Amino acid sequence: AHAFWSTQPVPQTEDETEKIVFAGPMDEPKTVADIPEEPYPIASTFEWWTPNMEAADDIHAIYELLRDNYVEDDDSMFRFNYSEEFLQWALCPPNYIPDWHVAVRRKADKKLLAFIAGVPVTLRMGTPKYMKVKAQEKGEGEEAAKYDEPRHICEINFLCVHKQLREKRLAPILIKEATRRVNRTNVWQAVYTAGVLLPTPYASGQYFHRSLNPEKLVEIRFSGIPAQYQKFQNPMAMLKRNYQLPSAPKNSGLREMKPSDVPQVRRILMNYLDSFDVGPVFSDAEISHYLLPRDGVVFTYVVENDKKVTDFFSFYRIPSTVIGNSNYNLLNAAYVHYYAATSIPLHQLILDLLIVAHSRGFDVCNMVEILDNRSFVEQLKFGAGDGHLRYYFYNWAYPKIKPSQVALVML
Numbered sequence: 001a002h003a004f005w006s007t008q009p010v011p012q013t014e015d016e017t018e019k020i021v022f023a024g025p026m027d028e029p030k031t032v033a034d035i036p037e038e039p040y041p042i043a044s045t046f047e048w049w050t051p052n053m054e055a056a057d058d059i060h061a062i063y064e065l066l067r068d069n070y071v072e073d074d075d076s077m078f079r080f081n082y083s084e085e086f087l088q089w090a091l092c093p094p095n096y097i098p099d100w101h102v103a104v105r106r107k108a109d110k111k112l113l114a115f116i117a118g119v120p121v122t123l124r125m126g127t128p129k130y131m132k133v134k135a136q137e138k139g140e141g142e143e144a145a146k147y148d149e150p151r152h153i154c155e156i157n158f159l160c161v162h163k164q165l166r167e168k169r170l171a172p173i174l175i176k177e178a179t180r181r182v183n184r185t186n187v188w189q190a191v192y193t194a195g196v197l198l199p200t201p202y203a204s205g206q207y208f209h210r211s212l213n214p215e216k217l218v219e220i221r222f223s224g225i226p227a228q229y230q231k232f233q234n235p236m237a238m239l240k241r242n243y244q245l246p247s248a249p250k251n252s253g254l255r256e257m258k259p260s261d262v263p264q265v266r267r268i269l270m271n272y273l274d275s276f277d278v279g280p281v282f283s284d285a286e287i288s289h290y291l292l293p294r295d296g297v298v299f300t301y302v303v304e305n306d307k308k309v310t311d312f313f314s315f316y317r318i319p320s321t322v323i324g325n326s327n328y329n330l331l332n333a334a335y336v337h338y339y340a341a342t343s344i345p346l347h348q349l350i351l352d353l354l355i356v357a358h359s360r361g362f363d364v365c366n367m368v369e370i371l372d373n374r375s376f377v378e379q380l381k382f383g384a385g386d387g388h389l390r391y392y393f394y395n396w397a398y399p400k401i402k403p404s405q406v407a408l409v410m411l
């Protein structure tokens, strides 16, 4: 039933997943020298291309492929429209490996047909707390602890095949070539997320959304006026009042993050992320890159009191193309990124995120139920969406975990 995934080192079923007791590799141990030197064979009318992500033209080519051919909703109404500036940010973090960005071009005209991207991440991915307890009960602690140390692996994103080339088995070719390029650098695990169900997630979470501009969301059919709003004389006025927010932040000590904040933000974030079973480890350079504000891309605020940063939050922008609406062309969404609260309840910190996003022209705030995101859903009027995000590893056995044990945000 899976002609490609049946051949790969991933858990093949839930049954098998349910029996996994320790973190560790699935495949035969290999070395760089075992891996083919030459790119995987491809049809003579195509060619491999490694884009230069500091070439504006190269970024633009990737941008147009994704604009026209990347993830849609299930009803042909919206398609993500990651910006060029976003793509440069996401695909070029500190110590990125240019060779991990893999494209296929039509040899004739250099038309971009397919793309997949890999970036480095340092991930805690050892045996989860609940399974370490089971291991102690069996006298198997050392086994359970073997892969505790953070590992330098690959994060995969932006897999895309042009609509005219779908269902021709090009995606497997891309995945095999990205795998080869990663393994040639002595890395043997990857982490990736997808909405679709593949063999086999180690975690899954629902999406949640919080309306910031209900008038617009209703006009574009992101939202409807919910049935209960009918018994009302005037549905929309009531809807706007429900989702109204303050014009200005409520925490007095809130301001935008600046470079001098990097060490303190690193400390409070890393202390917080320690409480989750799977999560990233960031250097100062990686905190700088992923969290310092960038116009139109990522937005980060700290709470500072007595000259100390005590809390922070970040969000990033992914707009979508609205297909066929005579009033609007774009949906402007804000996505909850990393945060840490030490001084105030998390709901009070994230209310200021909603206030800031609204004041900056965002239409909706999205998130997945990872981290402690469930703790502020009801008070802050988030609603569950139809969608789910599934978390996967390549070449890593891992026990099933709850999404509230996951701390990796994927863009």
Ligand SMILES: CCCCCCCCCCCCCC(=O)SCCNC(=O)CCNC(=O)[C@H](O)C(C)(C)COP(=O)(O)OP(=O)(O)OC[C@H]1O[C@@H](n2cnc3c(N)ncnc32)[C@H](O)[C@@H]1OP(=O)(O)O
Residues within 6 Å of the ligand: 001, 002, 003, 004, 005, 006, 069, 070, 071, 072, 154, 156, 157, 158, 159, 160, 161, 162, 165, 166, 167, 168, 169, 170, 171, 172, 175, 178, 179, 182, 183, 187, 188, 189, 190, 192, 193, 194, 195, 196, 198, 394, 395
């Ligand atoms: C150590 C390093 C390891 C590095 C790699 C780690 C693995 C990374 C894995 C990638 C993580 C990506 C994370 C993201 O970016 S998830 C976002 C994926 N992108 C989209 O949904 C954009 C819109 N769709 C498309 O561009 C295409 O439909 C894609 C490219 C998705 C499939 O193209 P197409 O529809 O033309 O099909 P095919 O004939 O070429 O290929 C059919 C085979 O592809 C398997 N398939 C379908 N969708 C996915 C999917 N989302 N991940 C993995 N596999 C997928 C499918 O089960 C089948 O295999 P099998 O069922 O027959 O066995």
Ligand SMILES: CCN(C)c1nc(N(C)C2CCN(C)CC2)nc2ccc(S(=O)(=O)Nc3c(C)nn(C)c3C)cc12
Residues within 6 Å of the ligand: 071, 072, 073, 074, 078, 080, 157, 193, 194, 195, 196, 207, 208, 209, 222, 318, 366, 384, 385, 386, 387, 388, 389, 410, 411
């Ligand atoms: C995983 C697929 N998926 C369900 C969603 N993916 C992403 N991404 C950023 C994707 C992008 C591709 N890849 C990284 C996974 C992350 N944002 C979303 C935001 C909201 C929701 S929903 O609220 O449940 N309904 C909805 C909306 C409001 N737009 N669309 C289109 C849907 C279905 C879903 C998603």
Ligand SMILES: [Mg+2]
Residues within 6 Å of the ligand: 161, 165, 166, 167, 168, 169, 170, 171
């Ligand atoms: Mg194909």
